[PDB]
């Protein structure tokens, strides 16, 4: 029953947003990044991007795809062309809607990039990504063998749960490949099956909504004075701050978010066994930690005198 899950991001389209670090400078990117969440334990993060996943360029379902917005025309590539990295390369697991799930190492940035023919697209964001160990032994890469603590990692399926984001009317995405000059006037050519609207300032205050017609206007000489917007009544976007909004109550629905933080099981390491030397009312502890290990002691009386210590070197505690 995956088609019942995917059917709500069919109402939506990918968009372009402002990314601060692109391949050269500051650009408008089709793969812009809204938020990175890293609160699952063993290295799984969940990116909310400005692209869409698990859908094809039409609206139907293709398996491992990124769907993006390239200056209005929606394009697509396979998922194995898209790579992202924090410090080391991350590994993309799955995608659903505006959301992506990756297995990432710890780092102070996220950079997603894909490669078209001779254009390289990138988007680096200053979003901190952390790695959260489980248990009282602080590893950096999850181990090979040990025991199994309970944990909380981002679930890998796109099951509808009780958490939502809010969708809206896309506003007037302005264009300038529409407006062009005649030999003596200004010419607006809206695309087929799409209505534009034109605001100019060459007479007094001029404004028009045009449909499907190469519609010239007299008294406008230079095309710097006319802005040709674009309109799409269908096809929701996210409530982004990198997009402008429409006029009047703005709201069209809400969608569920995939890959929520669920309870699970995680494998944790097991420290080398301490070597215990006994004496008269005293206990010595030889400790050889492989990776840093909390020692926590307490006494079973009315004053516990608890001791809490991160130990990362070979140490003897009496």
């Amino acid at each position: 029953s995956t088609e019942e899950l995917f059917n709500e991001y069919k109402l939506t389209r990918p968009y372009m947003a402002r990314c601060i670090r692109c391949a050269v400078g500051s650009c408008h990117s089709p793969i812009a990044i809204e938020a990175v969440k890293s609160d699952g334990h063993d290295g799984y993060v969940r990116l909310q991007t400005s692209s869409q996943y698990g859908l094809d360029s039409s609206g139907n379902l293709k398996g491992r795809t990124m769907r993006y917005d390239m200056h209005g025309t929606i394009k697509e590539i396979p998922l194995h062309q898209v790579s992202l990295y924090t410090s080391r390369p991350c590994h993309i697991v799955d995608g659903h809607g505006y959301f992506l799930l990756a297995r990432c190492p710890a780092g102070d940035s996220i950079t997603m990039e894909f490669k078209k023919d001779s254009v390289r697209h990138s988007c680096s964001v200053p979003y901190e990504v952390k790695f959260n160990p489980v248990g009282r032994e602080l590893y950096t890469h999850p181990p090979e063998h040990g025991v199994e603590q309970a944990c909380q990692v981002y679930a890998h399926d796109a099951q509808n749960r009780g958490a939502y984001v809010e969708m809206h009317l896309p506003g007037s995405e302005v264009d300038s490949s529409l407006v062009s000059l005649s030999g003596s006037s200004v010419t607006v050519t809206p695309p087929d099956g799409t209505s534009a609207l034109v605001e100019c300032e060459c007479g007094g205050t001029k404004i028009s909504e045009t449909i499907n017609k190469t519609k010239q206007f007299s008294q406008c000489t230079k095309k710097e004075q006319c802005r040709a917007y674009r309109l799409q009544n269908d096809k929701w976007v996210y409530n982004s701050d990198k997009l402008p909004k429409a006029a009047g109550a703005t709201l069209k629905g809400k969608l569920h978010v995939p890959f929520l933080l669920a309870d699970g099981k995680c494998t944790v390491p097991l420290a080398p066994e301490p070597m215990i030397t006994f004496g008269f009312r005293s206990v010595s502890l030889k400790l050889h930690p492989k990776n840093p290990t909390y020692l926590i002691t307490r006494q079973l009386a009315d004053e516990p005198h608890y001791t809490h210590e991160l130990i990362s070197e070979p140490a003897v505690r009496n």
Binding site: M16, H28, K37, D39, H71, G72, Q152, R161, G162, A163, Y164, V165, E166, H168, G171, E173, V174, D175, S176, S177, E199, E201, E224, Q225, C226, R227, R230, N239, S240, D241, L243, P244, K245, T250, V257, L260, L261, A262, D263
Partner: protein, 98 residues
């Protein structure tokens, strides 16, 4: 938390206003002297007297259900034991309250 942000309301050669919603910690401010850009060129034709409204509010995170901390108050406890009593080779195992 999760700082939610509404899209910027932009009017060309106009002036917006602040309409509140009484969302939690809902800040709103109106900025004048703005010449915004889209991907397909500039957004207004006016140099000045344009207006952009920022609106932000705090809502709680999507993972609030499985990752939250419960603040309680406790007083006047109640002790309860699982005894195993044998009186004259007749044994029971009963939760006694003490």
């Amino acid at each position: 938390y999760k700082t939610g942000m509404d899209s910027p309301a932009i009017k060309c050669c106009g002036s917006q206003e602040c309409t509140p919603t009484y969302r939690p910690d809902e800040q709103c401010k109106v900025f004048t002297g703005v010449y915004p850009f889209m991907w397909g060129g500039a957004y207004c034709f006016c140099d000045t007297e344009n207006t952009q409204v920022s609106k932000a509010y705090v809502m709680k995170s999507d993972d609030c259900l499985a990752d939250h901390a419960e603040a309680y108050k406790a007083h006047t406890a109640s002790v309860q034991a699982f005894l195993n009593i044998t009186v004259g080779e007749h044994s029971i195992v009963t939760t006694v309250y003490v």
